[model samples]
Target: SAVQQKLAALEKSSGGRLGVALIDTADNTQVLYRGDERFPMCSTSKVMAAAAVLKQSETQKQLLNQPVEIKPADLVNYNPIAEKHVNGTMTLAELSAAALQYSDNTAMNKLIAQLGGPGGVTAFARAIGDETFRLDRTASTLNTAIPGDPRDTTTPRAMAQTLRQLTLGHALGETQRAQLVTWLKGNTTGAASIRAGLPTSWTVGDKTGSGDYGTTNDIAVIWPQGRAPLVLVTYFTQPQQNAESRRDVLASAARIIAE
Candidate 1:
């Protein structure tokens, strides 16, 4: 109750719409603060695309290390890591790494295409019990969509559940899961959200996503010392544009949950 009250206060004071879900994997402990609200996931939706790709790799007998060609036109704008580079060939594994680590739009488009488009990504999420989730739009198109376009949306509950399944090895095979975790830990974006709230000694494998009109989110499996790991998901909407309030709320929520 106190935890919920604290989050409520933070949401009200920050002048932002907030949704959160914190899960303790040790004993199935859970905390939900507006967990059912839908929020655009932004680049964080890359995780779903990654998962789908891995699953397809397993089923289609494709290898993550297989080489794929990249062209300038194949890369989309907005955080285009590969787009800026000269046309070349890279392994599927490298593409995945770039997409997760740098939130590369071009790499993400490649992954989506590899998975047969956004519907394929959405199908995988739904198969894993995330009915409220959608990956209808690509990262480049996300910047141009109207509010609540359902292009890429997920509820905190759905996101937390997805992460829980992922951590528990329900979504991906052992090696695939390990690969996903490794990629998540290597994430180079959003160091100020959930990552900002953890103690220096803790470890977290997380994905962060941000969008126009004040949408910010972070979802991760956090490892605190001498305790079971926790899944923390924070979603914010209509927060102050170009301000630190959303990140602060996320960091505060992480600390409160850990305590």
Candidate 2:
């Protein structure tokens, strides 16, 4: 009742609908908050795409550390700051780090090209048992400016399940999963979501999807062996309210549940 009331008040105040799901990751305890609403994933879709590619690499015994030559044109086309750092080349690991850590759009595009396209990613999602999760398009800043096929989406529950799979070595081999977890640990977006209000020393792996159309979503795992790892996802649409308000609401909700 309290969660419902809080969610209602938020929607009324923000003039936006919010969807949420929190699970006790340790025990798989569930807390569904307007969990049925299918919200725009924004950059959160990158997580799914990244996991899919890495899982394939693991199967082929591909080493992430192998150096790969990148052209100035490719860098300019993909890295978040391609223009800022033109004519630079790096290994697959570097590109993946840039994509995940900086949420670099260009870097992500290049990686997607290497991993095959959205079709390949869609097949990967199915292998992981996510019937609802789909890859509608490659990651881009323009996701919500227009809508694409339903293949590009994810619910809170599915997001939580996916993250759990990544952490538990279900999505990729143990080594591959560890590498992905490392990248996620360094994630810079959604500092105010699951990461906010939690212990500074507590470990978390997460990805964020921030949208211009008042969309803010993140899926994360808060790790503490016996305790339920909190899986928090949230979305809001309000042209009037500021970003801090939306971030605060999401963070506060996680704090309440974690406490």
Candidate 3:
């Protein structure tokens, strides 16, 4: 199909593995490229963890507005937002915004802790019918490039399905769904990936993930003009590829799939 050929070319040019799953919810039309392979979720896993927290909050009547302290030890390097404040308190809702919008590592670590650990996040993925997704490590220990270690992981197909469910409001209640989606829409990261290739008329709300070992990924809900929205998930593991080139490939994939 047109989608497969376009994605495959991008993958080949990059000399790295690419996993993609694009689904049109309105027509139930879909396409995949290496969708079964496991790819590290990196920060993209934030949404999964957030979903768990939202579900728990709904069931337990927890306060999303409740304040949580950001202790010094909770601080992880590379977080511009959390770095400025060595110690302070923010509501869980604000913390989620930091993680999703800024990709703040420290904020994500704190959120994972609130969920009880990486296992808690994985359990949420499973509960949502994503059997291949896993979250075994927190952002605090995310930089180690040790192969096969429990760094968060997910297949393109699983991510696509999960995002699809969330967009459809099946993953959480209407209020929670709107909240999560709002945060995602505000994501300031990844202006260069899939979003770069989208037509100006289209709006893309997404989460991006990148790290050592040539991992660059974007999972998004794309709203094209005059059409039902679609889910687009892209993952790349190209150790030799640089961020700029990886992003170019992602952009190409997005344009191709949009057609």
Candidate 4:
């Protein structure tokens, strides 16, 4: 209620909708503000793809350590990490980090392909109990983020709950969970979003998604000074002409949850 009330005030001025899901594991607290509304997932889907890669690696015959070669055709927009590796080789572990830490588009394509495809990531979310997480296209196509399109989308509550299952729910092994956290903590894209609002002393690991129609999302697992971790997903979308995502939108939402 506190979160929703404040968010209502915030949205009253902004030309968009802000959907937030704040889950405090300490007391099992959940605050949902427009939490059930669908928002374009954009690059946030990489978190699910990376998790699927990890789940696939728990086997002895997996390709976690084996080399997977990259082709020129795999290159796509915003692929800073993977572009340089064309015609090169990277293990599943490295690709997962490239996807999460840098939001590398090509890295995501490669990792998603490893598990089968976009649907593979969806399967991973389904196996983990997520009801609305879906991945229907590769990075470039999915990031188109058509307004009102449901092809690549998830609700705030679904994304937050799915992320919670991966990091704090023991769905993944101890080592796998820690590894995912390590990658997320090193993310280079979320500083202006969720990470910018929390105190420096707090521990935070997060992922970000930015796309068309001014869609921007920041999903974070935060450990406050003396309490248990909180998983938060803040998503914004503006369908107006010339709309753009703002880092401040997500930062302010995180500030509310922090308060």
Candidate 5:
């Protein structure tokens, strides 16, 4: 409740629709504000896609190294990583890194293809008790971020819950979980989001997403000094034509939670 107050104040100043779920797995402390409401997931869905691929790999590690060929037709907007690999071959492992760490659009589609489609990723979410997590479309289509659209959206609560399950629950194998967190930790997308507000001594593994209509999101697993792991999420949306200046809203709230 205390955290909600601060988060609401944070939302008030920015005039954005905000939803946050901060779950301290160690102490089981929770702060939810509009937590059940859905928001466009943007590239944050890449984390789930990576987890789906990892879960599939548990049946056989060979899948992680499966070769995937890149083509120019496969490229999509915001494809920072995959565009470079066009006409080249990349393993599923490399594609996963491109999607999660760089939020690369084409690489994300490549990973989804490995899983069969967004429907396949949905099946993985169901297996992990994340019924609300859904990816109905690929990144370019999903990034539309219309205010009232429900497609390719998830509530902050469900998103954070899944991250917790993947990172701390037995939903995935030790090797798979480690690899997922490792990629998340290496992600450059979250550097200015939750990571910036955190203390230097703390450790974090996070993924970030951006989209039209002011959609910006970060979902993370963090360790504070010697404490157990915590899972946190912030999903913000606004009508601003350009929300470049408000990215720090996430960091500011992270600071509030850290207090």
Candidate 6:
């Protein structure tokens, strides 16, 4: 398979491990390559956390601009709750934006708590019949903690499926889904992931996550054909611990695969 060869070449080129998976959103047409391997998801867990929050927002009849109290103590380095300000009243939209846009760890952790914490999120994903899904504490530490958990993990297939569900209108209601999409649109972090490969205006519901173990990963609901969404996830790790060299290689691989 072309994908297989490319994967081998990429791994050899960067001296790092790589995995990729693709799914057609229209009818679940998936071409899986190393789709089942577990890897550090970095911040991608925020996607699930964000989705859970959107669902709660819809249920509680919360508006985008409705504000909530944030305290200075709530700010965390793993995932900053608020990108700029965390100690004031913020809307459901603001919280979501901070989580996605800045990849705010504190915001995402708070959202996870609001949505019943990690247990609730894992339960939510399981309810959807994704047996491969689980939430580990070390999943995303780009903001909260350095060298976080060693046990946090995910699979390429699972990451792609999350986006597939989102693109297919299976995750939340129309209003809530729209809000989630808007929040993702503002995402600026993890540009080295899936977003790196495509044109800027492609309209992707994507999230990037990076962490220790020399890891970089991304998941996206690519709206290429408009009706036929493509779910893609690429994960690479600098096993040698040379992040600078490996990151560019991973970026190149992601870009090539996106095409």
Q: Against the hidden reference, what TM-scores do the models get?
A: 0.92, 0.84, 0.93, 0.96, 0.96, 0.85
State the displacement of the C-alpha of residue 73, model 6, in Å, after optimal TM-score superposition. Answer: 2.3
lDDT of each: 0.80, 0.67, 0.81, 0.87, 0.87, 0.68
Q: Where is the poorest 10-residue window by lDDT in model 1?
A: 139-148
Q: How many angstroms is residue 107 displaced in model 6 relative to the true structure, after the best TM-score fit?
A: 0.6
User: Model 4: what TM-score?
Assistant: 0.96
Candidate 3 lDDT for residue 254? 86
Candidate 5: tens digits of C-alpha lDDT, residues 1-259: 6777888899999889888888888777777888899998988888888989998899876998998999988987878877887899888999999999888889899889988999988889998889898889976633588888888899998998889989888788999999998998888878889998899798999998888777888998998887888988988988865655356988988888888
The candidate, 1 or 2, that scores higher on TM-score is 1
Global CA lDDT of candidate 5, please? Answer: 0.87
lDDT of 3 by residue, 5-106 (tens): 878888888877788998888988778898887887878999887778888788767667877887778877567677666677877888888888898888
- What are the RMSD figures for all models against the true structure? 2.0, 3.1, 2.0, 1.4, 1.4, 3.2
TM-score of 5: 0.96
Q: Please write out the lDDT profile of model 4 over residues 1-259, one tens digit for every residue.
A: 7667888887767778899999989888899998999988988999999988888777744667878888888887788887788889988888888999899888899888888888888999999999799899987633477778898899999999988999998878778888998998899899999988888899899999988788888999998887888999999988763577787989988988888
Worst 10 residues of 6 by lDDT: 138-147
TM-score of 2: 0.84
lDDT per residue as tens, model 6, 2-83: 7677767877877667778888757767776678987777677788777877776776785556676777666666545464
User: Could you tell which candidate, 1 or 3, scores higher by lDDT?
Assistant: 3
Candidate 1 ranges with C-alpha deviation above 4 Å: 60-62, 141-146, 239-245
